[PDB]
Coordinates of C-alpha atoms in Angstrom, one line a residue:
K1 CA 7.8 79.8 -133.1
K2 CA 6.4 76.4 -131.8
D3 CA 2.9 77.7 -132.8
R4 CA 2.1 75.8 -136.0
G5 CA 1.0 78.8 -138.0
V6 CA 2.2 76.8 -141.2
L7 CA 3.3 73.1 -141.7
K8 CA 4.2 71.6 -145.1
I9 CA 4.0 68.1 -147.1
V10 CA 6.5 67.2 -150.2
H11 CA 16.5 68.4 -155.2
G12 CA 19.9 70.3 -154.5
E13 CA 20.7 71.1 -150.9
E14 CA 20.7 74.6 -151.7
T15 CA 17.3 76.6 -150.3
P16 CA 16.4 80.3 -151.0
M17 CA 18.1 83.0 -148.5
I18 CA 16.9 86.1 -147.6
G19 CA 16.5 88.6 -150.6
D20 CA 17.2 85.5 -153.2
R21 CA 14.6 86.0 -156.5
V22 CA 12.2 83.1 -156.5
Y23 CA 10.4 81.6 -159.3
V24 CA 7.6 79.4 -158.6
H25 CA 3.9 78.3 -159.4
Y26 CA 1.3 78.5 -157.2
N27 CA -2.2 77.3 -156.1
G28 CA -4.4 78.4 -152.8
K29 CA -7.5 76.6 -151.2
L30 CA -9.5 78.0 -148.1
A31 CA -11.7 75.0 -147.0
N32 CA -11.8 75.1 -150.6
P33 CA 4.9 82.3 -163.0
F34 CA 5.2 84.3 -159.8
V35 CA 8.5 85.6 -159.2
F36 CA 9.3 87.5 -155.9
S37 CA 11.7 88.3 -153.1
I38 CA 12.1 85.9 -150.1
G39 CA 12.5 87.6 -146.9
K40 CA 11.3 90.6 -147.5
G41 CA 7.5 91.1 -146.5
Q42 CA 6.5 91.2 -150.1
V43 CA 4.5 88.6 -149.7
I44 CA 2.6 86.1 -146.9
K45 CA 4.5 85.8 -143.8
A46 CA 4.0 82.1 -144.6
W47 CA 5.3 82.0 -148.2
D48 CA 8.3 83.6 -146.6
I49 CA 8.8 81.2 -144.2
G50 CA 7.9 77.9 -146.0
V51 CA 9.1 78.5 -149.7
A52 CA 12.3 79.3 -148.0
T53 CA 12.7 75.4 -146.8
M54 CA 11.8 74.1 -150.0
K55 CA 14.8 72.9 -151.8
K56 CA 15.2 73.5 -155.7
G57 CA 12.0 72.1 -157.5
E58 CA 10.6 70.6 -154.0
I59 CA 6.9 70.7 -154.6
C60 CA 5.2 70.8 -151.5
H61 CA 2.0 71.9 -150.0
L62 CA 1.5 74.3 -147.2
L63 CA -1.2 74.8 -144.8
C64 CA -1.4 78.6 -143.0
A65 CA 0.4 84.0 -141.0
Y66 CA -2.6 85.8 -142.6
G67 CA -5.2 88.7 -142.4
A68 CA -7.3 87.3 -139.4
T69 CA -9.0 90.5 -138.7
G70 CA -10.8 91.2 -142.3
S71 CA -8.8 90.9 -145.6
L72 CA -12.3 90.6 -147.6
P73 CA -13.9 91.5 -150.0
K74 CA -11.3 89.8 -152.3
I75 CA -9.8 88.0 -149.4
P76 CA -12.3 85.7 -147.7
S77 CA -12.5 87.1 -143.9
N78 CA -10.7 85.1 -141.0
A79 CA -9.4 82.6 -143.8
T80 CA -6.8 80.0 -144.1
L81 CA -5.3 79.2 -147.3
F82 CA -3.5 76.2 -148.6
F83 CA -1.1 76.3 -151.3
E84 CA 0.6 73.8 -153.9
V85 CA 3.7 75.6 -154.7
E86 CA 6.2 74.3 -157.3
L87 CA 9.8 75.8 -156.2
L88 CA 11.0 76.2 -160.1
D89 CA 14.1 78.0 -159.0
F90 CA 15.9 80.8 -157.3
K91 CA 18.8 83.1 -157.8
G92 CA 20.8 85.5 -155.7
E93 CA 20.4 89.4 -155.9
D94 CA 22.5 91.4 -159.0
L95 CA 23.7 94.5 -157.0
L96 CA 24.2 96.4 -159.9
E97 CA 22.2 95.0 -162.9
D98 CA 25.0 93.7 -164.5
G99 CA 25.8 90.4 -163.1
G100 CA 29.0 91.7 -161.3
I101 CA 28.1 91.3 -157.9
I102 CA 25.7 88.6 -156.8
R103 CA 24.7 88.6 -153.0
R104 CA 23.3 86.1 -151.3
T105 CA 22.2 87.4 -147.7
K106 CA 23.1 85.2 -144.9
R107 CA 22.2 87.3 -141.9
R108 CA 19.6 90.2 -141.9
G109 CA 20.8 93.5 -140.4
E110 CA 19.9 96.3 -138.1
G111 CA 20.8 99.1 -140.3
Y112 CA 18.4 102.0 -141.3
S113 CA 21.5 103.7 -143.2
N114 CA 24.1 102.4 -145.3
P115 CA 27.8 102.9 -145.6
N116 CA 28.3 105.8 -148.3
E117 CA 31.2 106.4 -150.4
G118 CA 34.1 107.7 -148.1
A119 CA 33.1 105.6 -145.0
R120 CA 35.2 104.1 -142.8
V121 CA 33.9 100.7 -141.8
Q122 CA 34.7 97.6 -139.8
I123 CA 34.2 94.4 -141.0
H124 CA 35.4 90.5 -141.3
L125 CA 36.2 89.4 -144.6
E126 CA 37.1 85.8 -146.2
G127 CA 37.9 85.3 -149.7
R128 CA 37.7 82.0 -151.4
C129 CA 39.0 81.5 -155.3
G130 CA 38.4 78.4 -156.9
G131 CA 37.3 77.2 -153.4
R132 CA 40.8 78.0 -151.7
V133 CA 40.4 80.6 -149.1
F134 CA 43.1 83.2 -149.6
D135 CA 42.1 85.7 -147.0
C136 CA 40.5 85.7 -144.1
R137 CA 40.9 88.6 -141.3
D138 CA 38.9 91.5 -139.6
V139 CA 39.7 94.7 -141.1
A140 CA 38.8 98.4 -141.0
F141 CA 39.2 100.6 -144.2
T142 CA 37.6 103.5 -146.2
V143 CA 35.1 102.7 -148.8
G144 CA 36.2 103.5 -152.0
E145 CA 39.7 102.9 -151.2
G146 CA 39.6 99.2 -150.3
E147 CA 42.4 98.6 -152.7
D148 CA 44.7 100.1 -149.8
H149 CA 44.2 96.9 -148.1
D150 CA 44.0 94.5 -150.6
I151 CA 40.3 94.6 -151.1
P152 CA 38.8 94.3 -154.6
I153 CA 36.3 97.3 -155.6
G154 CA 33.7 94.8 -155.8
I155 CA 33.5 94.8 -151.5
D156 CA 33.6 98.6 -151.4
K157 CA 30.4 98.6 -154.0
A158 CA 28.7 96.1 -151.8
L159 CA 29.4 97.7 -148.6
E160 CA 27.0 100.4 -149.8
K161 CA 24.1 98.0 -150.1
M162 CA 24.8 96.3 -146.6
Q163 CA 23.3 96.9 -143.3
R164 CA 25.1 97.3 -139.8
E165 CA 25.4 93.6 -138.8
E166 CA 24.7 91.9 -142.1
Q167 CA 26.2 89.1 -143.3
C168 CA 26.4 87.9 -147.0
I169 CA 28.0 85.9 -149.8
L170 CA 29.1 87.9 -152.7
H171 CA 30.2 86.4 -156.3
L172 CA 32.5 88.9 -157.8
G173 CA 32.7 88.7 -161.5
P174 CA 36.0 89.6 -163.1
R175 CA 34.9 93.1 -163.4
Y176 CA 34.9 93.4 -159.6
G177 CA 37.5 91.1 -158.5
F178 CA 41.1 92.1 -159.0
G179 CA 41.8 92.5 -162.6
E180 CA 43.6 91.7 -165.9
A181 CA 46.6 92.1 -163.6
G182 CA 45.6 89.6 -160.7
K183 CA 46.7 89.2 -157.3
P184 CA 50.1 87.6 -156.5
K185 CA 50.2 88.3 -152.9
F186 CA 47.0 86.1 -153.0
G187 CA 48.1 83.7 -155.9
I188 CA 44.9 85.1 -157.7
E189 CA 44.9 84.9 -161.5
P190 CA 44.1 87.5 -164.2
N191 CA 40.0 88.1 -164.0
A192 CA 39.5 85.3 -161.6
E193 CA 36.0 85.2 -160.1
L194 CA 36.0 85.4 -156.5
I195 CA 33.8 84.5 -153.2
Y196 CA 33.7 86.5 -150.1
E197 CA 31.8 86.0 -146.9
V198 CA 31.4 89.5 -145.2
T199 CA 30.4 90.8 -142.0
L200 CA 29.6 94.5 -141.6
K201 CA 30.4 95.0 -138.0
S202 CA 30.1 99.0 -138.0
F203 CA 30.9 102.0 -140.0
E204 CA 31.1 105.7 -139.8
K205 CA 29.8 107.5 -142.7
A206 CA 31.6 110.4 -144.5
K207 CA 30.3 113.8 -144.4
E208 CA 28.2 114.9 -147.4
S209 CA 29.3 117.8 -149.5
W210 CA 27.3 120.1 -148.0
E211 CA 28.0 119.1 -144.0
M212 CA 31.5 120.4 -144.7
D213 CA 32.4 124.1 -144.8
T214 CA 34.3 125.9 -147.3
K215 CA 37.4 125.6 -145.3
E216 CA 37.4 121.8 -144.9
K217 CA 36.4 121.3 -148.9
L218 CA 39.6 123.2 -149.6
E219 CA 41.7 121.4 -147.1
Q220 CA 40.2 117.9 -148.1
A221 CA 40.5 118.9 -151.5
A222 CA 44.6 119.0 -151.7
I223 CA 44.7 115.6 -149.8
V224 CA 42.2 113.7 -152.2
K225 CA 44.1 115.4 -155.2
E226 CA 47.5 114.2 -154.1
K227 CA 45.7 110.6 -153.4
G228 CA 44.0 110.3 -156.8
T229 CA 47.3 111.4 -158.1
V230 CA 49.2 108.5 -156.4
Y231 CA 46.5 106.4 -157.9
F232 CA 47.0 107.4 -161.4
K233 CA 50.8 106.8 -161.0
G234 CA 50.0 103.3 -159.9
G235 CA 47.6 102.8 -162.8
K236 CA 44.8 102.3 -160.1
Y237 CA 42.6 104.5 -162.5
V238 CA 39.2 103.5 -161.2
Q239 CA 40.4 104.8 -157.5
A240 CA 41.7 107.8 -158.9
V241 CA 38.5 108.7 -160.5
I242 CA 36.9 108.0 -157.0
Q243 CA 39.5 110.6 -155.6
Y244 CA 39.2 113.4 -158.2
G245 CA 35.6 112.9 -158.1
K246 CA 35.1 114.0 -154.4
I247 CA 36.7 117.4 -155.7
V248 CA 34.0 117.9 -158.1
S249 CA 31.3 116.8 -155.8
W250 CA 32.4 119.1 -153.2
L251 CA 32.9 122.4 -154.8
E252 CA 31.0 122.2 -158.2
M253 CA 28.1 123.9 -157.3
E254 CA 29.4 126.4 -154.5
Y255 CA 28.3 129.9 -154.3
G256 CA 28.7 132.9 -152.2
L257 CA 32.5 132.6 -151.9
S258 CA 35.1 135.3 -150.9
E259 CA 37.0 136.3 -154.3
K260 CA 40.0 134.4 -152.4
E261 CA 38.2 131.0 -151.8
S262 CA 36.2 131.2 -154.9
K263 CA 39.6 131.5 -156.8
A264 CA 41.3 128.5 -155.2
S265 CA 38.2 126.7 -155.6
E266 CA 38.0 127.2 -159.2
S267 CA 41.7 126.1 -159.3
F268 CA 40.8 122.7 -157.7
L269 CA 37.9 122.2 -159.9
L270 CA 39.7 122.7 -163.3
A271 CA 42.5 120.4 -162.3
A272 CA 40.0 117.5 -161.2
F273 CA 38.3 117.5 -164.4
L274 CA 41.4 117.3 -166.5
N275 CA 42.7 114.7 -164.0
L276 CA 39.5 113.0 -164.6
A277 CA 39.8 113.2 -168.7
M278 CA 43.2 111.5 -168.4
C279 CA 41.7 108.6 -166.3
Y280 CA 38.9 108.2 -168.5
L281 CA 41.5 108.1 -171.5
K282 CA 43.1 105.6 -169.9
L283 CA 39.9 103.6 -168.9
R284 CA 39.0 103.8 -172.5
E285 CA 35.6 105.5 -171.5
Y286 CA 36.0 108.3 -174.1
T287 CA 32.4 109.8 -173.7
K288 CA 33.5 110.3 -170.1
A289 CA 36.5 111.5 -171.2
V290 CA 35.1 114.4 -173.4
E291 CA 32.1 115.6 -170.7
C292 CA 35.1 116.1 -168.5
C293 CA 36.7 118.3 -171.3
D294 CA 33.5 119.9 -171.8
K295 CA 33.7 121.1 -167.9
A296 CA 36.9 122.3 -167.8
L297 CA 36.5 124.2 -170.9
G298 CA 33.6 125.8 -169.3
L299 CA 35.8 127.3 -166.9
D300 CA 38.8 127.8 -169.1
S301 CA 37.7 128.0 -172.9
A302 CA 41.7 128.4 -173.7
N303 CA 42.7 125.3 -172.1
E304 CA 45.5 123.4 -174.4
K305 CA 44.8 120.3 -172.3
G306 CA 41.1 120.3 -172.5
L307 CA 41.4 120.8 -176.2
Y308 CA 43.8 118.2 -176.6
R309 CA 42.4 115.5 -174.5
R310 CA 38.9 116.4 -176.1
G311 CA 40.4 115.7 -179.8
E312 CA 42.1 112.2 -178.6
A313 CA 39.0 111.3 -177.0
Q314 CA 36.5 112.4 -180.0
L315 CA 39.0 110.8 -182.4
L316 CA 38.9 107.3 -180.4
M317 CA 34.9 107.7 -181.0
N318 CA 35.4 108.3 -184.8
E319 CA 33.8 111.8 -184.8
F320 CA 37.0 112.8 -187.1
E321 CA 35.1 116.2 -187.9
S322 CA 34.6 117.2 -184.4
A323 CA 38.2 116.3 -183.4
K324 CA 39.7 118.3 -185.9
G325 CA 37.7 121.0 -184.6
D326 CA 39.5 120.3 -181.4
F327 CA 43.1 120.5 -182.7
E328 CA 42.5 123.5 -184.7
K329 CA 41.2 125.2 -181.4
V330 CA 44.7 123.6 -179.8
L331 CA 47.4 125.4 -182.4
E332 CA 45.3 128.9 -182.2
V333 CA 46.2 128.4 -178.6
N334 CA 49.4 127.5 -179.2
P335 CA 51.0 127.3 -183.1
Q336 CA 53.9 125.5 -181.7
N337 CA 52.0 122.4 -180.3
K338 CA 54.2 119.2 -181.2
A339 CA 51.4 116.4 -181.6
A340 CA 48.5 119.0 -182.5
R341 CA 49.4 119.3 -186.4
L342 CA 50.2 115.5 -186.6
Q343 CA 47.0 114.1 -185.2
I344 CA 45.0 116.5 -187.2
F345 CA 46.7 114.7 -190.2
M346 CA 45.6 111.4 -188.5
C347 CA 42.3 112.6 -188.4
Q348 CA 42.1 113.2 -192.3
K349 CA 43.6 109.5 -192.9
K350 CA 41.1 107.7 -190.4
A351 CA 38.0 109.6 -191.6
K352 CA 39.0 108.4 -194.9
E353 CA 39.7 104.9 -194.1
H354 CA 36.5 104.8 -191.9
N355 CA 34.7 106.1 -195.5
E356 CA 35.7 103.6 -197.4
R357 CA 34.9 100.6 -194.7
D358 CA 31.4 102.0 -194.2
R359 CA 31.3 101.4 -197.9
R360 CA 32.3 98.3 -198.4
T361 CA 29.7 97.0 -195.7
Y362 CA 27.0 98.8 -197.1
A363 CA 27.4 97.3 -200.5
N364 CA 27.9 93.9 -199.2
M365 CA 25.2 93.7 -196.4
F366 CA 23.0 95.3 -199.3
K367 CA 24.1 92.8 -201.9
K368 CA 23.4 90.2 -199.3
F369 CA 19.8 91.1 -198.6
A370 CA 19.6 91.3 -202.6
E371 CA 20.2 87.5 -202.8
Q372 CA 17.7 87.2 -199.9
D373 CA 15.3 87.2 -202.9
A374 CA 14.7 84.1 -204.1

């Protein structure tokens, strides 16, 4: 707006983008480190317009976009502060507190809501890798299943933090790009970091657990089971977890059901927990494995699979005694269990080997300190 509300005086040719996290130093003056997030009304409107024009380290002076009517006591009446702001540095938004998905918002959106997992979305995708564009199209897909249209799980995750019509840049770390496997169709290598430009044109959210009737849950349950299973067979474990989770999400707290419904429901529920257990043992997330077994056995205490997988997992977490507890209960439920007995053996074996190691470590690290007394 031509109206001179703010004007300024004065590094890299990059400047803070909406949502960026800024690092600066300031000072004001009427007639005479503070890190925030630009683009958001999290500070003066002027600080959102001027600081958002400074190149990195661009020390400048601004003359302001503030409380005309009455900001005092603490904020002098219809004042007009002046600032010196050393733009130290700015970074993109870390969407999952894990440096896995860093976003740079390019064009604010109109959304009030966001795509939830299961939503069907219409977007535009552009994927670079090492600076080479390997994908550019408009595509429709469902959130959590982008792997079906050759889209890394990172995009699905970011879509849940994106508004309708929003445009952004996403820096996916290996964890969210394709993986150890890479992507030959696109010529992408194992664990390659990727950069995507994305535009969320629109989306239709998936129904929440409670908006579906028992009829639908049970019908949808058979479909996602199948889908989660096809994923398992192809080693797309992360996606199988999402598919089996919907089942737990839909039927875990259900109450007031026909004996017939209730039974068909606990049936799905048990299979889902046990299937999740496999996925987690595959994903090497043992604590998750065990938790799924604890669920399953709360529905069926004599479940061989739950007791076995519970032991595979506990053995891997080194709870040797606990794990043994598992296989004991396996053979009581099935004395002819092949692998059962054999593991118990190993439980002992490894608990012995683990106790030895803890001892050489304790001794040495202890010795270490003692020699630290000069």
